[PDB]
Amino acid sequence: DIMVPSFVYNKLPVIHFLQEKRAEQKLRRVLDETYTEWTEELDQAHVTDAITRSLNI
């Protein structure tokens, strides 16, 4: 009725602070590991060159 309640009350602030920091850490990780991926596609010049070769030119 008296002791354990008081010590729980004393614990509350530190735990709240640490959990807030942990959540911030996880969202920070979410944004950190995002990168824009630029894909590379076969240049159409080679396609045009192959078309010319097929024509026997």
Binding site: D43, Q44, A45, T48, D49, T52
Partner: protein, 48 residues
């Protein structure tokens, strides 16, 4: 009566690099057109 001429000697065929008009179609095909010009010059030097 000195030397007249070397019939063996032949003037090499002077090659001129082919020019393409500067349009958007040329920029898209710049690499391809350049390859054709290089092939043309190689053919002229070697003969065929």
């Amino acid at each position: 009566r000195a030397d007249e001429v070397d019939y063996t000697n032949l003037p090499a065929p002077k090659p001129q690099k082919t020019v393409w008009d500067d349009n958007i179609e040329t920029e898209v095909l710049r690499k391809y057109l350049d390859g054709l010009s290089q092939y043309d010059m190689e053919e002229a030097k070697y003969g065929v």
